[PDB]
Amino acid sequence: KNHTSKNQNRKDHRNGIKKPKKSAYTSHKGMCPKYLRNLRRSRANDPRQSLR
Amino acid sequence: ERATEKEKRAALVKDHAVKSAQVYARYYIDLVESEKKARENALKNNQLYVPDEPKVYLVVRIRGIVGVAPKVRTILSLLRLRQINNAVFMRCNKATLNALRIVDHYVTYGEPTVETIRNLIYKRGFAKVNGQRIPIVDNNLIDEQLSKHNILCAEDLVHEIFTCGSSFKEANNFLWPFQLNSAALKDKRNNFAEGGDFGYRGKYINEFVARMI
Amino acid sequence: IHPLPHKIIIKKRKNKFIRFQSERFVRVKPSWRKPRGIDSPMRHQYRGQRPMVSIGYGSDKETRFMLPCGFFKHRISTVHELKTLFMNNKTHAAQIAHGVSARSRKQILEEAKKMGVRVLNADAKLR
Amino acid sequence: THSQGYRCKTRYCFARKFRRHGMANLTTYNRVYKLGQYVNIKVNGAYHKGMPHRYYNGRTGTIFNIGPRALGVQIQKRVRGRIMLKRINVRLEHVHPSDCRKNHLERVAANDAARRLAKETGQPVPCLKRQNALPRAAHVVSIASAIDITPLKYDGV
Amino acid sequence: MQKYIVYGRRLPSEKFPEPEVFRMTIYAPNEIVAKSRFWYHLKSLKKIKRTHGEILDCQHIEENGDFVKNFGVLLRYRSRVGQHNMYREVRETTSARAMDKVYSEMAGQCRARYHDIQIINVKEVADEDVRREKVAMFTQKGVRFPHPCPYVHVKRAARTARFQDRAPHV
Amino acid sequence: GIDLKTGIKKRKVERKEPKSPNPYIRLLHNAFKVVYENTGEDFTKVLTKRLCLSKTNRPVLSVSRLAHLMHKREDKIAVVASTVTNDERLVTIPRMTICALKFSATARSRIEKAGGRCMSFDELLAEKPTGDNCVLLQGRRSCRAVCKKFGSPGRPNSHVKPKGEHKGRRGARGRHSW
RNA sequence: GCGCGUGGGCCCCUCCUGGUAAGCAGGACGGGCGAGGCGGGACGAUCCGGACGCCGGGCCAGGGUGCGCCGCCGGGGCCCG
């Protein structure tokens, strides 16, 4: 056999079809830098601020 | 004090049962009479009285667990039919009835009569308490798990299942899927319409399950 | 010498489990060994193959380890062991070891009679 | 499949419709998009920059990033036994707003509306749960006009 | 086998408030086969699928067996080569019984099963009009015929009595 | 045959008993389990599982972390299921009541000098078996050097250090060097 | 988290491709055998049913019911397997 796709979909669905995990949806990877800098500037004020 | 509460509760369920058994019996008798009178009125008017569409079906798996297709297996597991000769009651809605047609080859279904429901609930009925198969031998076990749904006694149970009432899902889930004797089966390969056994048997499910109980 | 009443003792298989092909070859001993061949008719348990050892054949816990008399067995080598091991049990019976000499087996039998302890091999080395 | 280029088997997928060849309507560039909006991805053949891949055609995603000219959208792609969140940047011509949850948004509004209306008049609360068809009621049908119908004879040969 | 007059209509729609009620007489072993054969005819004749339609009633007809009547059935059957039409007359006590006779003769001679035979018309033919010679033979009042099979009685009796002192005379 | 392979997803392994040869740890686990059976207090449900944990699962908690954790609640008795250790970095330890499986000698002296009481699990069972006025605290599990290296180094999104010295250009100096 | 075996597959369905075809060579959803005992198709790794602790009773699938060989009779039609 040069190639077979038989059983491949039984193996995939045996313990698989898994969700991409949380923190992947709310990841900042590939978000515009200028927006991310604005977010950090806004967060660092009053209740959101986490510095001393 | 717990024994005193148990004695008091037992009487309340027995009292509810001595009344319900008689209330429900009138409802079943009236249903036969009401359809008959409505039919008589319709024929005088040259009209036809259509009866109400079935609201509950008794589904019995008639095929084995070997070589089952993945969709078929998934649907059968949701019907709770995981072994051959197992029987369950399901509500009739487009969501259940479209799924049942996909698994028709593996099952036989029909509208159940009240006597067929009573015999299954009494002779073969087992609860699902703590994920265990606990035999339903008394009205106390039904009261314990279904008092919230007002299903205090066995007559309430064979009534909810038959009328497909508000607490049908709770009542049906309380019952471990029925385990029955082996069916006669003229032909497992074809549909009851083609003269086999699979698919809609209609009123004939009552006859089919009779021997199995 | 008479034990507790007990229940019927059901032995799931009366005959011993014999190794496959022990009959054909002397080199293959009858002691049970699990078949592990790629094409072994006994591994496949085909029709007419010899029965396979399984936990299902296990005896009832209540009547397991019980001698045909109805008393379980305790192996005795010295009078102290009879006095200590058979401490008022009505369930177990004594059985003197093969090694114990005739001279000692008279003093082991005598203490047993005083303690009312059944000895399964009472008539051993008797001359 | 000896050759696997970025645009293979795209003869029909990345080709414009019978009378739709031409320049994108200005609405595509005038539609406001907000983060978390569901957007369907359908390639436009005319536009060759920001084009997604043939897999992404027919997929619905949420806008993780909004950027000067292209919106970043995250779809779920089933790779073997795992679905992976594939973040892609797609130019406006190939991203169209999805009705998607529009039914749910309508339902949330209608359920709340039919709750307040009841508090005022028609006090019993309405059933705000979907019922999947259900069986038909008994009803009555006149068979006065009933027509007999019979199997017809064969005439083909 | 039982004779069921089945009524059915398309589901009521905004486009048509009362769809037409259709009536067919279907001969079937049970009600579920009769409602299936109803929809098979409805799908072809009036373009009504079961999903798009309702069964108003499946009334079972009781037929008297007091007297043998000449019956005439016009049907269409599919052979391996292609479909054909056929008129068969059978004399039977009831119309369902005559349909059973027609189905058994079709299975025996034309090798056609119930599903591949459509019953265009079932009527009670008069004694005067009997195109089939077999039915015409018994139609005349005086019909003395010697027993067709008196061998069967002695062969049947001999199953219980395997060994007999004499060979039985018929 | 019954189809038990559909909506059913195998069984899980959870340590229900401590693998510790120490007789003391077994004595407390059985005691805390007996309390849990009779009164299903969730503080005792966790303590019973915190005594069954492995050494790696049970990390050390210093008197510096405990001071920070109990900053708003001096009255509450810290309950640690591992070793309490001294932090020479913190010059002054506050008075705190801590109950642990072991206190380092340097830590034990410091807590007593502060006026705090170093309790033991047996003492906690005698005074507060259900866990009243007690906080179940835990050290940082993923602080082990072994945890830092878990993963496939050399994968683009892995962000983990390689196990050996390696000392070469290919694959290290950025995505392009692969 | 740590690892093992495996990376020669084959067969039935279904649409396939090349070839005159093939128990041929290549694809593919699903299932089976591999690694599934057992009853049946005379025989048969895969077909039809049914997937296996050890037993006793009952029911009964699939396949059948002259005799070998457990188990059949009734009715309608045909009628040189």
From TrEMBL, chain B:
Lineage: superkingdom: Eukaryota
Ribonucleoprotein among keywords: yes
Gene Ontology molecular function terms on file: RNA binding; structural constituent of ribosome
Cellular component per GO, a single term: cytosolic large ribosomal subunit
Protein residues bound to Mg(2+): Q179
Pfam families in the cross-refs: Ribosomal_L30
Keywords: Metal-binding, Ribonucleoprotein, Ribosomal protein
Keyword Cell inner membrane tagged: no
GO biological process: maturation of LSU-rRNA from tricistronic rRNA transcript (SSU-rRNA, 5.8S rRNA, LSU-rRNA)
Family listed: Belongs to the universal ribosomal protein uL30 family.
PANTHER family xref list: 60S RIBOSOMAL PROTEIN L7, LARGE RIBOSOMAL SUBUNIT PROTEIN UL30
Entry protein name: Ribosomal protein L7
Protein source organism: Giardia intestinalis (strain ATCC 50803 / WB clone C6)
Organism phylogeny: Eukaryota, Metamonada, Diplomonadida, Hexamitidae, Giardiinae
TrEMBL record, chain C:
This protein's record includes keyword Phosphoprotein: no
KW RNA-binding (keyword) present: no
Record's keyword terms, sorted: Ribonucleoprotein, Ribosomal protein
One cellular component (GO) term of this entry: cytosolic large ribosomal subunit
MF (Gene Ontology): structural constituent of ribosome
Pfam families documented for this protein: Ribosomal_L32e
SUPFAM superfamilies xrefs: Ribosomal protein L32e (SSF52042)
Any GO BP: translation
SMART domains per the UniProt record, alphabetical: Ribosomal_L32e
Domain of life: Eukaryota
InterPro entries for this protein: Ribosomal_eL32, Ribosomal_eL32_CS, Ribosomal_eL32_sf
Entry similarity comment: Belongs to the eukaryotic ribosomal protein eL32 family.
Protein name, as recorded: Ribosomal protein L32
Provenance organism: Giardia intestinalis (strain ATCC 50803 / WB clone C6) (Giardia lamblia)
Automatic annotation (TrEMBL), chain D:
Molecular-function GO term, any one: structural constituent of ribosome
Keywords, alphabetical: Ribonucleoprotein, Ribosomal protein
GO biological process assignments: translation
Keyword Ribosomal protein: yes
Family annotation (InterPro entries): Ribosomal_eL21, Ribosomal_eL21_CS, Ribosomal_eL21_sf, Translation_prot_SH3-like_sf
GO CC terms: cytosolic large ribosomal subunit
Keyword Ribonucleoprotein tagged: yes
Pfam families: Ribosomal_L21e
PROSITE patterns: RIBOSOMAL_L21E (PS01171)
Family the UniProt entry places it in: Belongs to the eukaryotic ribosomal protein eL21 family.
PANTHER family (UniProt xref): 60S RIBOSOMAL PROTEIN L21 (PTHR20981)
Official protein name in the record: Ribosomal protein L21
Organism the protein comes from: Giardia intestinalis (strain ATCC 50803 / WB clone C6)
From TrEMBL, chain F:
UniProt keyword list: Ribonucleoprotein, Ribosomal protein
Organism (species): Giardia intestinalis (strain ATCC 50803 / WB clone C6)
UniProt-recorded Gene Ontology molecular function terms: RNA binding; structural constituent of ribosome
InterPro entries from the UniProt entry: Ribosomal_eL18, Ribosomal_eL18/eL18-A/B/_CS, Ribosomal_uL15/eL18, Ribosomal_uL15/eL18_sf
Protein known as: Ribosomal protein L18
Gene3D superfamilies: 3.100.10.10
GO CC terms: cytosolic large ribosomal subunit
Disordered: annotated span: 1-20, 152-178
Family the UniProt entry places it in: Belongs to the eukaryotic ribosomal protein eL18 family.
Composition skew (Basic residues), residue ranges: 158-178
Gene Ontology process terms (BP): translation
